[PDB]
mmCIF file of all heavy atoms in Angstrom:
data_model
loop_
_atom_site.group_PDB
_atom_site.id
_atom_site.type_symbol
_atom_site.label_atom_id
_atom_site.label_comp_id
_atom_site.label_asym_id
_atom_site.label_seq_id
_atom_site.Cartn_x
_atom_site.Cartn_y
_atom_site.Cartn_z
ATOM 1 N N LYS A 1352 -5.967 -10.326 18.765
ATOM 2 C CA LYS A 1352 -6.988 -9.692 19.573
ATOM 3 C C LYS A 1352 -7.766 -8.723 18.680
ATOM 4 O O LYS A 1352 -7.174 -7.999 17.869
ATOM 5 N N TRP A 1353 -9.086 -8.700 18.823
ATOM 6 C CA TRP A 1353 -9.910 -7.823 17.998
ATOM 7 C C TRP A 1353 -10.350 -6.513 18.646
ATOM 8 O O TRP A 1353 -10.576 -6.421 19.853
ATOM 9 N N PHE A 1354 -10.496 -5.502 17.800
ATOM 10 C CA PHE A 1354 -10.907 -4.186 18.246
ATOM 11 C C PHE A 1354 -12.139 -3.815 17.449
ATOM 12 O O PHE A 1354 -12.398 -4.391 16.401
ATOM 13 N N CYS A 1355 -12.902 -2.862 17.972
ATOM 14 C CA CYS A 1355 -14.133 -2.418 17.332
ATOM 15 C C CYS A 1355 -14.235 -0.916 17.535
ATOM 16 O O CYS A 1355 -14.110 -0.422 18.654
ATOM 17 N N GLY A 1356 -14.448 -0.173 16.451
ATOM 18 C CA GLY A 1356 -14.549 1.263 16.588
ATOM 19 C C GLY A 1356 -14.869 1.978 15.286
ATOM 20 O O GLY A 1356 -15.500 1.413 14.411
ATOM 21 N N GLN A 1357 -14.443 3.225 15.185
ATOM 22 C CA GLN A 1357 -14.691 4.025 13.991
ATOM 23 C C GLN A 1357 -13.726 3.609 12.898
ATOM 24 O O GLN A 1357 -12.564 3.328 13.174
ATOM 25 N N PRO A 1358 -14.190 3.603 11.633
ATOM 26 C CA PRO A 1358 -13.428 3.217 10.443
ATOM 27 C C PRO A 1358 -11.934 3.404 10.535
ATOM 28 O O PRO A 1358 -11.458 4.442 10.988
ATOM 29 N N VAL A 1359 -11.196 2.398 10.083
ATOM 30 C CA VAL A 1359 -9.743 2.465 10.099
ATOM 31 C C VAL A 1359 -9.171 1.811 8.842
ATOM 32 O O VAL A 1359 -9.835 1.014 8.180
ATOM 33 N N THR A 1360 -7.941 2.162 8.497
ATOM 34 C CA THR A 1360 -7.291 1.604 7.317
ATOM 35 C C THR A 1360 -6.077 0.842 7.802
ATOM 36 O O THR A 1360 -5.493 1.227 8.799
ATOM 37 N N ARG A 1361 -5.689 -0.237 7.133
ATOM 38 C CA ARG A 1361 -4.494 -0.925 7.583
ATOM 39 C C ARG A 1361 -3.268 -0.374 6.869
ATOM 40 O O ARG A 1361 -3.262 -0.185 5.648
ATOM 41 N N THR A 1362 -2.227 -0.089 7.636
ATOM 42 C CA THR A 1362 -0.991 0.433 7.099
ATOM 43 C C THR A 1362 -0.070 -0.753 6.876
ATOM 44 O O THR A 1362 0.213 -1.110 5.734
ATOM 45 N N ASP A 1363 0.390 -1.361 7.962
ATOM 46 C CA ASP A 1363 1.241 -2.535 7.865
ATOM 47 C C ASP A 1363 0.558 -3.693 8.625
ATOM 48 O O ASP A 1363 -0.499 -3.499 9.224
ATOM 49 N N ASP A 1364 1.155 -4.874 8.597
ATOM 50 C CA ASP A 1364 0.519 -6.032 9.228
ATOM 51 C C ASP A 1364 0.176 -5.881 10.700
ATOM 52 O O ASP A 1364 -0.562 -6.681 11.262
ATOM 53 N N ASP A 1365 0.689 -4.843 11.324
ATOM 54 C CA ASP A 1365 0.409 -4.644 12.728
ATOM 55 C C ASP A 1365 0.107 -3.184 13.054
ATOM 56 O O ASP A 1365 0.357 -2.718 14.163
ATOM 57 N N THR A 1366 -0.462 -2.477 12.089
ATOM 58 C CA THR A 1366 -0.773 -1.076 12.280
ATOM 59 C C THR A 1366 -1.854 -0.600 11.328
ATOM 60 O O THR A 1366 -1.783 -0.841 10.126
ATOM 61 N N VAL A 1367 -2.846 0.092 11.880
ATOM 62 C CA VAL A 1367 -3.950 0.651 11.122
ATOM 63 C C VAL A 1367 -4.048 2.125 11.499
ATOM 64 O O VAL A 1367 -3.349 2.565 12.405
ATOM 65 N N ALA A 1368 -4.899 2.887 10.831
ATOM 66 C CA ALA A 1368 -5.052 4.306 11.148
ATOM 67 C C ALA A 1368 -6.433 4.787 10.780
ATOM 68 O O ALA A 1368 -7.103 4.195 9.932
ATOM 69 N N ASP A 1369 -6.848 5.877 11.415
ATOM 70 C CA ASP A 1369 -8.159 6.439 11.191
ATOM 71 C C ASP A 1369 -8.419 6.658 9.714
ATOM 72 O O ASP A 1369 -7.631 7.294 9.019
ATOM 73 N N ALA A 1370 -9.524 6.106 9.240
ATOM 74 C CA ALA A 1370 -9.909 6.291 7.865
ATOM 75 C C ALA A 1370 -10.641 7.625 7.904
ATOM 76 O O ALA A 1370 -11.802 7.709 7.511
ATOM 77 N N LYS A 1371 -9.966 8.653 8.426
ATOM 78 C CA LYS A 1371 -10.547 9.994 8.538
ATOM 79 C C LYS A 1371 -11.077 10.453 7.181
ATOM 80 O O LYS A 1371 -10.322 10.596 6.222
ATOM 81 N N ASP A 1372 -12.379 10.687 7.100
ATOM 82 C CA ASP A 1372 -12.968 11.101 5.844
ATOM 83 C C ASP A 1372 -14.339 11.744 6.015
ATOM 84 O O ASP A 1372 -14.838 12.394 5.096
ATOM 85 N N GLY A 1373 -14.954 11.540 7.180
ATOM 86 C CA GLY A 1373 -16.256 12.133 7.445
ATOM 87 C C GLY A 1373 -17.477 11.217 7.450
ATOM 88 O O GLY A 1373 -18.579 11.672 7.750
ATOM 89 N N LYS A 1374 -17.298 9.945 7.125
ATOM 90 C CA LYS A 1374 -18.427 9.016 7.099
ATOM 91 C C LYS A 1374 -18.439 8.036 8.288
ATOM 92 O O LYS A 1374 -19.141 7.018 8.275
ATOM 93 N N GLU A 1375 -17.679 8.343 9.327
ATOM 94 C CA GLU A 1375 -17.648 7.475 10.505
ATOM 95 C C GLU A 1375 -18.896 7.624 11.357
ATOM 96 O O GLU A 1375 -19.390 8.732 11.534
ATOM 97 N N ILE A 1376 -19.402 6.516 11.876
ATOM 98 C CA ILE A 1376 -20.565 6.572 12.739
ATOM 99 C C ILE A 1376 -20.111 7.311 13.995
ATOM 100 O O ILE A 1376 -19.105 6.969 14.597
ATOM 101 N N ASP A 1377 -20.878 8.324 14.368
ATOM 102 C CA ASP A 1377 -20.629 9.182 15.514
ATOM 103 C C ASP A 1377 -20.501 8.438 16.830
ATOM 104 O O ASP A 1377 -21.308 7.566 17.143
ATOM 105 N N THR A 1378 -19.492 8.796 17.611
ATOM 106 C CA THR A 1378 -19.279 8.131 18.896
ATOM 107 C C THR A 1378 -20.551 7.882 19.705
ATOM 108 O O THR A 1378 -20.694 6.832 20.338
ATOM 109 N N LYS A 1379 -21.481 8.824 19.699
ATOM 110 C CA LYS A 1379 -22.691 8.650 20.475
ATOM 111 C C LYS A 1379 -23.506 7.428 20.085
ATOM 112 O O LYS A 1379 -24.252 6.900 20.905
ATOM 113 N N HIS A 1380 -23.356 6.958 18.851
ATOM 114 C CA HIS A 1380 -24.116 5.802 18.390
ATOM 115 C C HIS A 1380 -23.404 4.473 18.595
ATOM 116 O O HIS A 1380 -23.962 3.409 18.328
ATOM 117 N N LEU A 1381 -22.171 4.533 19.072
ATOM 118 C CA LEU A 1381 -21.408 3.315 19.268
ATOM 119 C C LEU A 1381 -21.441 2.774 20.691
ATOM 120 O O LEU A 1381 -21.306 3.522 21.660
ATOM 121 N N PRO A 1382 -21.631 1.454 20.829
ATOM 122 C CA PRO A 1382 -21.672 0.774 22.121
ATOM 123 C C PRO A 1382 -20.431 1.132 22.928
ATOM 124 O O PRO A 1382 -19.474 1.700 22.419
ATOM 125 N N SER A 1383 -20.454 0.766 24.205
ATOM 126 C CA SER A 1383 -19.314 1.015 25.079
ATOM 127 C C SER A 1383 -18.209 0.017 24.688
ATOM 128 O O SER A 1383 -17.018 0.258 24.914
#
């Protein structure tokens, strides 16, 4: 199943995490 959102990094084959760094497109600009 696919997801769409602010930048993320993959940790393990079934886990990712926020690519927290400051260059993510602001929530206000992202579709619902």
